[PDB]
Every structure is written in C-alpha cells, then in structure tokens.
Amino acid sequence: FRKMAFPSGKVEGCMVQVTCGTTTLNGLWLDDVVYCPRHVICTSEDMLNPNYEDLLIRKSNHNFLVQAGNVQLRVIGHSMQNCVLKLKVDTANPKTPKYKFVRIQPGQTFSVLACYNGSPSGVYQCAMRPNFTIKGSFLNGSCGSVGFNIDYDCVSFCYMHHMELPTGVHAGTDLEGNFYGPFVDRQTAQAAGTDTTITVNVLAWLYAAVINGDRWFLNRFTTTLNDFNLVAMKYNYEPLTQDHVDILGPLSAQTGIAVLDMCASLKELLQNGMNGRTILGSALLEDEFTPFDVVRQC
Amino acid sequence: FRKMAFPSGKVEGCMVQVTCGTTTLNGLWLDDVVYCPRHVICTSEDMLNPNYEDLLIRKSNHNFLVQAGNVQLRVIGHSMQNCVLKLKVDTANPKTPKYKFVRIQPGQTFSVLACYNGSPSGVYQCAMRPNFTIKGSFLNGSCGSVGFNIDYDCVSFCYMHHMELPTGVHAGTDLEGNFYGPFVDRQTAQAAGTDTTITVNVLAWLYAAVINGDRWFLNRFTTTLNDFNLVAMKYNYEPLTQDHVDILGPLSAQTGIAVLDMCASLKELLQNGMNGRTILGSALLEDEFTPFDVVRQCS
Ligand SMILES: COc1cccc2[nH]c(C(=O)N[C@@H](CC(C)C)C(=O)N[C@@H](C[C@@H]3CCNC3=O)C(=O)c3nc4ccccc4s3)cc12
Ligand SMILES: COc1cccc2[nH]c(C(=O)N[C@@H](CC(C)C)C(=O)N[C@@H](C[C@@H]3CCNC3=O)C(=O)c3nc4ccccc4s3)cc12
C-alpha cells in the first residue's frame, strides 16, 4: 500500500504566475479568471498586519503582471474574496478542465502540485489533519500552489497554499479564500491545535488489512458510537461522525464486518497495544489512507 | 519532506490503449510509433511458453486496435524489439515531448504513471531495487504503464511494466524491451535474488532528516570507510563507494556533518535499532530517496 497522487496534467495546464512589484506567486487560471493569494499585493513592511482593503484600493488592473510561462495575460478586472484575489483576464484558458471548488473535511486526502514561479516542480498526496494543517513540503515561493482530487475527469480544487507554521506544518485556504482552521494571512507565528489521530482512516486501514487476509485483531464484541467516541478521545483519537460511518459503508459491505464491530476491534487495540504483532507489515497504525484510497488501491 | 513524483502531464498525453483479440494493455505513443509489451499478442493458451516471433509473424496490421481516447489510430507497420512491440501508426502524436530512452542503475529513482485501459490513474515515486525489482502499486491491466524522470522539459523514459512477482513486488523492462533482472515474460511464478538496502540513499535521507530539524540519531563517533562497509555488509546493506561519498558532499557541506560521521550514526542505528523512535515519521530506515532527490526537494 502506498501514497498515490492523481495525475497532475489537468492542473499543470492551469498554473500561471502573478507578480506585483517584485513579489511573484502562483495562480490558477480557469476560464477567464486567475485565482491567487491576496498577499501578492503586500510589500515587506505591510505584512505584519496588513490592511488588505486599503492596499487594494491603491491597486489598478495595470499593476498586475499575469504570465503563462513568458506570455503576458492582460488583466481587465480585479476583486478580493476572503483571502484570495480574483483577476479577470482577457483570454479564456483553453486547457480549463471540468472543475469544482470544494471545501474538504479533516481526514480527507488530496494531491498537491508544488509550483515555483508558475512552474510545476512535483506532486504528492497530503491529508488534512484534524487541527486543519497539512504535513506538506513547501519552500519559499510556493504560495498559490493548489491541492485537488480528480473524479471521472472533473477536478475538485480544495486547497491553496499560504503559510508554514513554526512547527513545520502548513496552512492554507479553500478556493473561495477561507482558511482551514484558525489561521490568518499575516507574517506572524501562529499555533495549531494539538493534533489527533484520524480515526476514520485508521478504520479504513484495518479494513484493508482484512481484505488482504490479516485479521487476527477482529473480535466478537461490538460498541455504540457514543461509547467508542468517549474512549477514542482518551487516546487522542478523533471522534467518529455520521458521515464517517457512511463512507466506511462500501468497505463494511465488501468484508461483511459491521462498522461498529470494527470500532470495538480498534478499541481493544487502543487499550492493549499491538503485542509486537503487526498489521499489514507494520507496528504503527496508518491514518492518512481514506476509505476511497483503500478501494482505489483494490 | 515527502516522497515527491514528477508532474506527469507530459507523459499523460502519450498514453494509449492497445488491443489484440481479447487482450488489452497500455501503450506509449511517441511521434508516429506506439510502444507496448509484446505479450498483448498472446492468448491464454500461449502464455506459458510463447514463441513470440512465431506468434508475431502470424499477425496482421489490422489485428492491432490502437485507441487514443475515443479516436482509433491505424497501424501501418509493426516490429519487435526484445520484449517490446513497436507499432507504426499513420498519425503523429502532437503532444510528444522532447524525450530519451535510458536504462537506470539500481538505487536510482523514477516516477511511475499507473494507467488502465490507456487512461492515467495515479503517479508515485519508485526506486530500482538492487535485485532489479520495484515495490510498486499495479493491478490487472496495468502492463505498459511507464516510469520516467524529467529534466528541463526532457522526459527520460526508463521503465515499462510487465509483471507482479508472487511476493507482490514488480518487474519490467527498459524501453528497448530488455528486462531489469533475471525475469522473463512468461506466465510463471518467478522469484528475485535476495534484496539489499540502498546505503547511499539511507544516508541521503538521514541528511534530509537533519535539514528538517531532526538530530536525535547523530552521535560523536566517527568511522573509516572500510569499517562502515564491513558492518553494512553484515546487515545486508550495499557497500558505500568513494563515488557515493563525493555525491553526498553537497549535503554534508550544507549541514556541516562529515559523511563518515553520518556513517557512524547509521552504524549505531543498525547495531542498536531505533528503539521505537521515529525519523521523518517513519519507524524504518528509508532507502528510496537519492541524494539528488533530497537536494531537489530541500532546495
Ligand atoms: C514572523 O512570522 C513568522 C514566524 C514564524 C513562522 C512564519 N511563517 C510565516 C509564513 O508562512 N508567511 C507566509 C506569508 C504570509 C503573509 C501568509 C509565507 O511566507 N508564505 C510562503 C510559503 C512559506 C514560505 C516557506 N514555506 C512556507 O510554505 C509564500 O509562498 C508566500 N510568500 C510571500 C512573499 C511575499 C508576499 C506574499 C507571500 S506568500 C510567517 C511566519
Ligand atoms: C502462474 O503464473 C504466475 C504465478 C505467480 C505470479 C505471476 N505473475 C504473473 C504476471 O505478472 N504475469 C504478467 C503476464 C506475463 C505474460 C508477463 C501479467 O499479468 N502482467 C500484468 C500486470 C500484473 C497483473 C497483476 N499486477 C501485476 O502488475 C498485465 O498487465 C498484463 N496482463 C496481461 C494479460 C494477458 C496478456 C498479457 C498481459 S500483460 C504471472 C504469475
């Protein structure tokens, strides 16, 4: 089992650069609109606590340099939506895929196309942590790179990159400019909530183990959702939601193991440890494979 | 620090479907030629001991059905190169990138674009193991998927997929159709030679751990190159050459840790273990990052 990204070509065709003064970041060109982080308009001395409304009043369409490679796209309008700038340009992107903007939940995974100066550098799979950070790999100049899923040729954009916390994890917004978690776009040290283990993904991993014949950990007990959630919190595990139970449905049907029966199996693992026995060849439970990732790889 | 693949768009525009009779697998369309595994011509009976040149002489151009998306491309010729079939078509691929065919060395990495029915499914990073297998993720119908590196808009193709061993690892060929390793395109259960760990890559990765602010495994000791190699061979690690030491130089300079000092740290980890501690989130020593991979990501 491995972390697999989606093929990135449909997103590569949409990356451009956006420059104000000497500040260049990545933007996303869809139809005739370019989306990018609003702090492209910030000077170094306004970053501590910028006045974005006041900074944007001073800007005009002709202050924005938008380039696809070396080709300039003329800007004919601009607006701000939360923490993203929307630049209307005079050309509709001929490589625009079928697409949606979506806001994901903690535990969901997505692919990140890491870009520098509008040019793709690499692709990898990330999971949104319960404290709304991602464990990414981003350098200076990566802001504006996006994360996405692809379903039947439709790209669902879910992440745009804005910042690196002092602990080395990353934070950003959806494509409507709303941050995931309690962060703000200022040059300031911010801290995330203490992280927790993604319970729904650990259960998906147990299902994958069963599918491959590794099932020693199954037991004859069951539990209520509420009883399991109260126990999980004592072990720094996320509580399960109704949506979590539902996305485990296909794996539950495939193995014949009820979701609440698998919860009682995980609950025994939590109170007693693994006893040096492994699951799928590991002493550690994996929590960054979603139920969809598991059926993707089968 | 994550396992990072190359962006796959330049390869996506080359993937097609090839069908013969009831068999379907993926092909690579470059200019006017489609490359695919030759056993697309095999029927089920043929699989065990196919005489390929004999089976190929009995095929006509019109037996090959090549599809790019919804469009069919007409085969105007065909030839075989080792385990790869080369189908000449009447249309040139306009999305053909600049490219080259290369044979990689054990321990080098590449990106794999997994495809089914000519459609890209996922992309991830693999290393050519010392025993010439790869620990990939491939299901039925993945044959013909390719592995590649990218350098300044030039795509270097190095792997085409052919089989899964009983142990679950994978085997394939370069784009001239020669297998990596002692494998053969027969429907038989085949075993690989005993694998070993890629030592220069483990060292590159420990350096990455330092760059990302993790130092719990460093120590005050030092070792000679030969004495490290004796312990490494004991633990089934490949020997470390002076070429590898030089290669790690940029990394050593960056962190101020001499190569043989980092070797002393790896020696202790091999002799004492990790004691349930973690490195970059892993409980095991990672060996599928090359020194180039580390430099490219960290800077
Ligand atoms: C004293 O303040 C700190 C204390 C402790 C940790 C800290 N982290 C950050 C922080 O992240 N700032 C944001 C920017 C702010 C405005 C969101 C930022 O630099 N984003 C980067 C990606 C970063 C860089 C390293 N790899 C990460 O992913 C990015 O690309 C952008 N660059 C610029 C350059 C100019 C103008 C806009 C942008 S946006 C500040 C900070
Ligand atoms: C008693 O035989 C075994 C015993 C123990 C383990 C074994 N493994 C294999 C084995 O791998 N065979 C090759 C095929 C051989 C000819 C190279 C094969 O199936 N390749 C797959 C990719 C495979 C499938 C599962 N995931 C992997 O990646 C592929 O796509 C192709 N399918 C066909 C189907 C028909 C015709 C051509 C192709 S080519 C056989 C075998």
Author numbering:
A (entry chain A): 3 to 300
B (entry chain B): 3 to 301
What does the paper say about this structure?
The main protease (Mpro), also called 3CLpro (3C-like protease), represents an attractive antiviral drug target. Mpro is able to cleave pp1a and pp1ab at 11 sites, catalyzing the formation of a series of non-structural proteins critical for virus replication and transcription.
In order to figure out the inhibitory mechanisms of YH-53, we first determined the crystal structure of SARS-CoV-2 Mpro in complex with YH-53 at 1.93 Å resolution using the cocrystallization method. Specifically, YH-53 exhibits an extended conformation in the active site, which is located in the cleft between domains I and II of SARS-CoV-2 Mpro. The benzothiazole group of YH-53 is well accommodated in the S1′ pocket of SARS-CoV-2 Mpro. As clearly indicated by the electron density map, the carbonyl carbon of the benzothiazole group in YH-53 forms a C-S covalent bond with the sulfur atom (2.14 Å C-S bond length) of catalytic residue Cys145 in SARS-CoV-2 Mpro. This nucleophilic addition reaction results in the conversion of the carbonyl to a carbinol hydroxyl, which forms hydrogen-bonding interactions with the backbone NH of Cys145 and a water molecule for stabilization. The carbonyl of the pyrrolidine-2-one group forms a hydrogen-bonding interaction with the NƐ2 atom of His163, while the nitrogen atom forms additional hydrogen-bonding interactions with the carboxy groups of Glu166 and Phe140. Therefore, YH-53 occupies the active site of SARS-CoV-2 Mpro by covalently binding to Cys145 and noncovalently interacting with several conserved residues, including His41, Phe140, Gly143, Cys145, His163, His164, and Glu166.
